């Protein structure tokens, strides 16, 4: 009755809900978690028709993630509650505040694999349900409502552009992990990861270098399978910001050192993407010319074909007019 009444009894919000978090660590965590999540849900819905509200949201989720890190037992009950909500409603209880809170907790390895698995299965189920509903009008007549989860996952990008720290970290982690998860709904998931990475690069100005380093390292990790979509993402991210590549240089040469290992026509895309880096800088041009000289004199055809194919792009890139 106490928690119900004080939940009914809604600046001073973060200390107050911190006190309730301690009391519910003594008492029942699920009820207060549901109450606060719902309350912020109608707050956001009212806002749908703000800066202080976003600051309050960031502060309170910071207190919640700090408390959950202090006491990790609450997380299992929270995930059980969310599983029950997902069972009870067709993708309901997944709002921008809730997913922001979930992403904030997915940085300290507190069962982050479980978080990613839950999000992935929910996303695939939502996409499959929408796909089935779109096919027939008889379904559309009876079941008009639809809970598209991609809409909220895109909206939390804009919601998290006001300075939240853990939220963007978890968001980038999910966006990267979706690429490995995808390895058709899988194409939808891959496009969904590419869109999230493009949006969070376009938004998070201070975090450009970390994203560039992460995608560059992932691109040249191992040529086990086709990674052409990674190269498309590389082109899309680098074409937006030209000077960004210059700051994070001297890693391009390391990738160039072993380009002629598993070329599947991705070398043309990579060279076309990083051509702006090559034209402005002469050191990269010298290193690439050295690699091409190594390739052309090679005695094996497999490396030779990629070498001459890249060599053609090198020749056509630079104008010889004067």
């Amino acid at each position: 009755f106490v928690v119900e009444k004080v939940l009914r009894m809604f600046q001073e919000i973060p200390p107050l809900v911190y006190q309730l978090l301690l009391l519910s660590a003594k008492g029942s965590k699920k009820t207060v978690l549901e109450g606060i999540i719902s309350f912020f849900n109608q707050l956001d819905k009212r806002q749908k028709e703000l800066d202080q509200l976003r600051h309050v949201e960031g502060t309170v989720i910071l207190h919640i993630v700090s408390a959950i890190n202090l006491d990790q037992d609450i997380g299992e009950e929270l995930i059980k509650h969310l599983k029950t909500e997902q069972q009870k409603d067709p993708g309901k209880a997944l709002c921008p505040f809730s997913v922001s809170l979930l992403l904030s907790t997915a940085v300290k390895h507190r069962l982050q694999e479980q978080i990613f698995d839950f999000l992935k299965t929910s996303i695939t189920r939502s996409c499959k349900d929408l796909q089935i509903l779109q096919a027939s009008k008889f379904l559309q007549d009876l079941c008009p409502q639809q809970y598209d989860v991609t809409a909220v996952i895109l909206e939390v990008v804009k919601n998290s552009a006001f300075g939240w720290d853990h939220v963007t970290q978890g968001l980038v982690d999910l966006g990267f992990s979706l690429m490995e998860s995808y390895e058709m709904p899988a194409q939808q998931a891959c496009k969904l990861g590419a869109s999230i990475l493009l949006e969070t690069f376009k938004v998070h100005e201070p975090i450009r270098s970390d994203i560039l380093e992460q995608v560059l390292n992932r691109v040249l990790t191992k040529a086990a399978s086709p990674v052409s979509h990674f190269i498309d993402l590389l082109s899309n991210i680098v074409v937006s910001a030209p000077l960004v590549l210059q700051n994070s240089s001297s890693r391009v040469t390391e990738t160039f050192d072993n380009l002629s290992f598993l070329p599947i026509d991705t070398v043309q895309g990579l060279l076309r993407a990083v051509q702006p880096l090559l034209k402005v800088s002469m050191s990269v041009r010298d290193s690439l010319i050295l690699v091409l000289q190594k390739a052309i004199f090679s005695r094996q055809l497999d490396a030779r074909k990629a070498a001459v194919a890249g060599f053609l792009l090198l020749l056509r890139n630079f104008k010889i007019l004067g």
Binding site: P90, I132, K137, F138, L139, L142
Partner: protein, 301 residues
């Protein structure tokens, strides 16, 4: 492009050019996707296709298959297709005989495209595929069912009520011994499983509509399946008379046990609902019927 097809269909039998008609139908199918479903042009196109299928009569198998596929692809996006399936089931039932062998049926030819030549496994598999799609749709909807609840249940019950008539019409057809029988038996087992899944919800969660559905299933579908199972014995025996024989027999006789198992599962859950709700739902369903066997030693020589 409609004029060329209209001209070729009305041409004399001397010059037909079946490949031209097939390509024209495929082009029409490809171009139909551009039309907006809400436009009046879509309704005009549907009316033209239905008129063409009803009026003309064709003997080529591929042309009829293409035309019916086009018609169903249009009809799914606009309304439920069960009425057309019922009409086609009645037409194919009229075209061929009946297993009873003491009943006379005359005329009632709704569609001229369906005739004695065309009532082959083509139209029988084409109809059963659409029925399977409808059943998968209803299976998806029922799991969502588990003020809105009343509307959803009222919507769900009508589909099964209409589909039972289609299967009742098709069960009483003396079909050939091919894949058309196997598809029929497998679809029968599937629909009984769907009815079981529906009843399990009311177990977990009485009304007049469900009682009417159970009465209809008991009266129209349950007794006919056993008669069909008797007829297919003679059908398969006559087929095997003309012709790895053990593998052929096992493949031919495979789906009957699954049908029996599905019927008994439905009966079991129906009894559970009956005794947990104080309604004698079992009054509608008759007793079961079982098959024995014997060996004629005289005919062994």
């Amino acid at each position: 492009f409609q004029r060329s097809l209209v001209n070729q269909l009305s041409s004399a039998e001397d010059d037909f050019n079946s490949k031209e008609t097939q390509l024209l139908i495929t082009i029409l199918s490809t171009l139909s996707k551009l039309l907006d479903p809400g436009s009046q042009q879509f309704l005009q196109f549907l009316t033209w296709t239905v008129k063409i299928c009803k009026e003309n009569a064709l003997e080529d198998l591929s042309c009829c298959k293409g035309l019916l596929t086009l018609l169903f692809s249009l009809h799914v996006l606009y309304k439920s297709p069960v009425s057309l399936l019922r009409e086609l089931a009645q037409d194919i039932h009229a075209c061929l005989g009946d297993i009873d062998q003491d009943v006379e049926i005359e005329s009632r030819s709704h569609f001229a495209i369906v005739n004695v030549k065309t009532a082959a496994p083509t139209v029988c598999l084409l109809v059963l595929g659409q029925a399977d799609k409808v059943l998968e749709e209803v299976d998806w909807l029922i799991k969502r069912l588990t003020n809105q609840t009343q509307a959803l249940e009222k919507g769900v019950i009508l589909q099964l009520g209409t589909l039972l008539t289609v299967f009742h019409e098709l069960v009483q057809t003396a079909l050939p011994a091919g894949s058309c029988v196997d598809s029929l038996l497998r679809s029968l087992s599937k629909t009984y499983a769907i009815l079981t899944s529906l009843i399990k919800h009311y177990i977990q969660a009485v009304p007049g509509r469900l009682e009417k559905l159970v009465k209809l299933s008991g009266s129209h579908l349950t007794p006919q399946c056993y008669s069909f199972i008797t007829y297919v014995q003679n059908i398969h025996s006559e087929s095997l008379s003309f012709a790895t024989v053990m593998a052929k027999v096992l493949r031919d006789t495979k789906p009957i046990p699954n049908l029996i198992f599905a019927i008994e599962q439905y009966e079991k859950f129906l009894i559970h609902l009956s005794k947990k709700s104080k309604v004698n739902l079992m009054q509608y369903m008759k007793l079961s019927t079982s098959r024995d066997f014997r060996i004629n030693a005289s005919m062994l020589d």
